[PDB]
Amino acid sequence: GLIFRLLLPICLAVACAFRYNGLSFVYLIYLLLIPLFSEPTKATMQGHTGRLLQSLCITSLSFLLLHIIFHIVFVPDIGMFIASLTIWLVCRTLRRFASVASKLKEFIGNMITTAGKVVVTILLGSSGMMLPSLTSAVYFFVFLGLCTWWSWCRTFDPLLFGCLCVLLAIFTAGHLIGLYLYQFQFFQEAVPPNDYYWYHHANPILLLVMYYTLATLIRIWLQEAVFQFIMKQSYICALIAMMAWSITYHSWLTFVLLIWSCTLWMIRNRRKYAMISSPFMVVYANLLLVLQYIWSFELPEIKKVPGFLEKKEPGELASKILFTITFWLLLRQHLTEQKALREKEALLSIMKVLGNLVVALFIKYWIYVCGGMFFFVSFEGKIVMYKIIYMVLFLFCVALYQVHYEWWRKILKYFWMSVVIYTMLVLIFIYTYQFENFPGLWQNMTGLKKEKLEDLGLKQFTVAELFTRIFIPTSFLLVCILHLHYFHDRFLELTDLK
Ligand SMILES: *[C@@H]1O[C@H](CO)[C@@H](O)[C@H](O)[C@H]1NC(C)=O
Structure with a gap:
């Protein structure tokens, strides 16, 4: 019944974690071999494997003794004793955790068998971003490729998935062999992949649990009401993440993402064009992600580009993944909706008063919000030239309204256009x-002293204050364009002398 085996993985791990010779390598091999076979039952295969393991271990102890006796630190003995005890227990076929461990095994195994694909992808991504190198690049790239493939409508048949699991399993097996076998080799640099023996000493255990989940999976394979506003918020947050990306990893590349988000804010029907431009955004995002991962390696002989992409830490990539998942979800939604529309066209071939009241209230009382935003934009932090030009525009608008009011009714939309243009600049x-x-x-180009130039706001910021310096004018631009698109003409036709 509740006759477990994971204890043998545990003791084999703690046995191979501290002794490194040709004697422990076979122990690690058999450790890697365990998760392929089933639990001990009335079977011959697992039984003979266990019995041969015990024979080999006891004989290795005997060989150590017959070596040490010739005269003309041996925890392996305790491991052998525990192995023989487990052999006898299998041959046979206060206390709180007895059934707790069984329940844990059951629910975790059922969790694997239901949707093991996504947890394997999560493990791939974690192993990738854990310790960047040319070897972990394999895991990271197959992670990215699988995520991109899932983003598209194109699916995958389970046999190719299984062969990919087999390939990744043998690859991580070789990787663990190299890792826990490197304690003899004599090198320190000129090779990226690995190093010698959480910052970098927590990766092998992750690779091990990865291989174990892969082993369970391959063993399984061989047993022959408001969600519309939520979609709106989805594309909105995808756009805002696209914008916020260009602040963390400042480079002349992500400037294109920033300017794209900016020019996408100021368009009439932004959802349509966002859904249209979704796939290009996804591919460009993951491409520059590959560039990030490449140039975030361990070795400093890469000669980072000065103005373009530069050198970063391995930790500053999970945020980029969090950014890219928004693009993935956006593309998924776009493709699903487009397919639904296509199949539809193929098939073919009490609260209103509240809405009216609030839209009228905004038509009549939004220009004042736009005006009040000027003060929030111009009266924060230090005082510089462009914050003064903002107030100059505002005061000019108010003065022109007070003076003539016939020109002011004709040159209103031009004012907002100039405002958004100046904000973009x-x-x-x-x-x-x-x-x-x-x-x-x-x-x-234009000779000014350092501080005399900095007085115009131009200075070297940090990764924190630049968020403010970018978003405050961005929020102002957003409010201004929101006013210009919906409320401007209705407001202008509301208050007039007929
Ligand atoms: C300022 O920089 C340019 C960069 O090409 C270089 O010609 C020189 O260092 C300076 N040029 C001037 C002062 O016009």
Whole structure:
């Protein structure tokens, strides 16, 4: 019944974790071999495997003794004793955890058998981002490829999935062999893949549990009401993550993502064009992700590009994964909806008063919100030139409204257009002033002293304050375009002299 075997994995692991010779290597081999066979039953295969393991271990102890006796630290003995005890227990076929462990095994095995694919992908991603190298690049790339394939509608038949599991299993087997076999080799650098013996001493256990889940899976394979607003928020958060990416890993590449998000904010029907441009965003995201992972290796002889992609830590990649999953979900939704529309067209071939009241209230009382946003934009932090130009525009608008009011009714939308244009220019200028040539290019082109130039807001920020310096004007632009698109013309036709 509750006749377990994982105890043998446990003791084989603790036995191979501290002794390193040709004697423990076979113990590690058999440890790797355990998760392939079933639990002990009325069977001959697992029985003979166990019995041969015990024979080999006892004989190895005997060989150690017959070596040490010739005269013309031996925890392996206790391991052999435990192995023989388990052999006898199998031949036979206060206390709180007895059934607890059984329940744990049962529910975890059922968790594997239901949706093992996604947990394998999660393990692949974790192993990839754990310790970057050329070897872990295999795991990371197959992770990324599987996630991209799932993002598309194209599915996968289980036999190819199983052969991929077999390939990855033998690959991680060889990887663990190299890892726990390296304690003899004599090298320190000129080779990326591994190192010698959580920062980097927690990877082998992750690879081991990965291989164990893969082994259970392959063993299984050989037993022959408001969710619309939620979709809206989904594409919105995908866009905002696309924007926020270009702040963490500042480079002349992700500037295209930032400018794309900016130019996508200011469009009439943004959902349609966002869904259209979704796949390109996904492919570009994962491409620059591969570039990130490559240039985040262990070795400093890569000669990072000065203005473009540069050198980063391994930890600063999970945030990029969190960004890319938004693109993946966006593409999934877009493709599903497009397929539904296509099959539909193939098949063919009490609260209103609240809405009216609130839309009228916004038509009449939103220009004041846009005006009040000027103060929040211009009166935060230090005082610089562009924050003064903002107030200059605001005061000019108010003065022109007070003076004539006939021109002010004709030159209103042009004001908002100029405002959003100026905000875009401010974004571009404050973003580009973070490279290396620019802080000197401004002087060499237009000679101004360092602080005299910095007084215009241009300075070297940190990864925190730049979020503010980008989003505050971004929020202002968003509010302004929201006013311009929906409420402007209705407001202008509301208050007029007929
Ligand atoms: C400023 O930088 C440029 C970069 O090409 C270089 O010619 C020189 O260092 C300076 N040029 C000036 C001062 O015009």
